[PDB]
Amino acid sequence: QGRLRLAVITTAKYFIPRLLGEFIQKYPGIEVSLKVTNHEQIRHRMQNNEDDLYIVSEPPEEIDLNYQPFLDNPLVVIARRDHPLAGKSNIPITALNDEAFIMREKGSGTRLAVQNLFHRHYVDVRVRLELGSNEAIKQAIAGGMGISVLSQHTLVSEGARSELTILDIDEFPIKRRWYVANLAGKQLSVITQTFLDYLMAVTKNMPA
Amino acid sequence: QGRLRLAVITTAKYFIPRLLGEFIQKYPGIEVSLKVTNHEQIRHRMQNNEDDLYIVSEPPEEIDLNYQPFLDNPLVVIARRDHPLAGKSNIPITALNDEAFIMREKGSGTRLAVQNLFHRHYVDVRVRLELGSNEAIKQAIAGGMGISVLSQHTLVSEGARSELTILDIDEFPIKRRWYVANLAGKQLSVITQTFLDYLMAVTKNMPA
């Protein structure tokens, strides 16, 4: 028996549940409660010590954590397939200037990495939609409301008649990783420790 | 010009963005910030008066709101298509007893309606996964981790080789509606008022 409490960043909401399936067959006593949030909300969770484990791409600055990388999390430029640059290669990052660009909510680590990248490269995009969900943003792109940068893991749901496409823009993908983390020095439960080793083992040489 | 701040329940994250597309073409000055949450978190938003408009299915009890229904939000039983009851009709609600059943996070209105319905009907389900996201739950069902009850709006993404199926269980769908709401007596901005009328008009006799 036992409860495992996971908090994960938004982009891990498909992967982790799917991994839970094998895990839970292997340990039928174990209950799992999963919270899905953005990086800002997950810092608070960590500050109130709410969970056993946290999955993050960017470690919160003011929290002391142990962690291991287990999977790449490349962030890519997504557009609709009728975009004029769809299908083109070696697109300079300068081509993004003044493009209609949908942003995630404040507190998103996705947004903060895009902002840092654009600042670093003197890129100015035209933002009028701040949409607090990866799925909302994919819908907006599909409805012709612009391009965005999201985790490539969000495109795993896209099949068949997917309107979405990755633009091969320079400086992309934003190289980023998923980490499994716990409060530094925190004595981990045996359930927690078991999941952690399970996660590390199943992901060992896995691509994205 | 102007900013519109929308907070919506999780199940409205596909619909509303898609409706934003026509709206924003019509008013190119208008910036829209969208937050996506569950009912518990949206009560807090309302308590701190954070947004112009709120989309909810169940009005928070202790907040005084104006609101209008604009779209049905039927909650249905979802399983994987190899489920033994997949494809059967007039399934009594008693068939749910001891079924492996994935729940949403505490604070979900989806969860509270399922709990009320099951209590009312003396149904006990076997819960070991509490997954804080509709998408997480669809992934779990697809990976054979059980059945759940979600908004039918979450199945709009399912196409092609969808593993998911609606079980025709009695007492389902849970009849529920999306409402667009604002703090009672709150003087609405002209941007806000414009969106509201736009929403009401475009949804007027729309099915689900």
TrEMBL record, chains A, B:
<protein>
    <submittedName>
        <fullName>Rubisco operon transcriptional regulator</fullName>
    </submittedName>
</protein>
<feature type="binding site">
    <location>
        <position position="136"/>
    </location>
    <ligand>
        <name>2-oxoglutarate</name>
    </ligand>
</feature>
<keyword id="KW-0238">DNA-binding</keyword>
<feature type="binding site">
    <location>
        <position position="13"/>
    </location>
    <ligand>
        <name>2-oxoglutarate</name>
    </ligand>
</feature>
<feature type="binding site">
    <location>
        <position position="135"/>
    </location>
    <ligand>
        <name>2-oxoglutarate</name>
    </ligand>
</feature>
<feature type="binding site">
    <location>
        <position position="133"/>
    </location>
    <ligand>
        <name>2-oxoglutarate</name>
    </ligand>
</feature>
<keyword id="KW-0805">Transcription regulation</keyword>
<comment type="similarity">
    <text>Belongs to the LysR transcriptional regulatory family.</text>
</comment>
<keyword id="KW-0804">Transcription</keyword>
<feature type="binding site">
    <location>
        <position position="134"/>
    </location>
    <ligand>
        <name>2-oxoglutarate</name>
    </ligand>
</feature>
<dbReference type="GO" id="GO:0003700">
    <property type="term" value="F:DNA-binding transcription factor activity"/>
</dbReference>
<dbReference type="GO" id="GO:0006355">
    <property type="term" value="P:regulation of DNA-templated transcription"/>
</dbReference>
<dbReference type="GO" id="GO:0000976">
    <property type="term" value="F:transcription cis-regulatory region binding"/>
</dbReference>
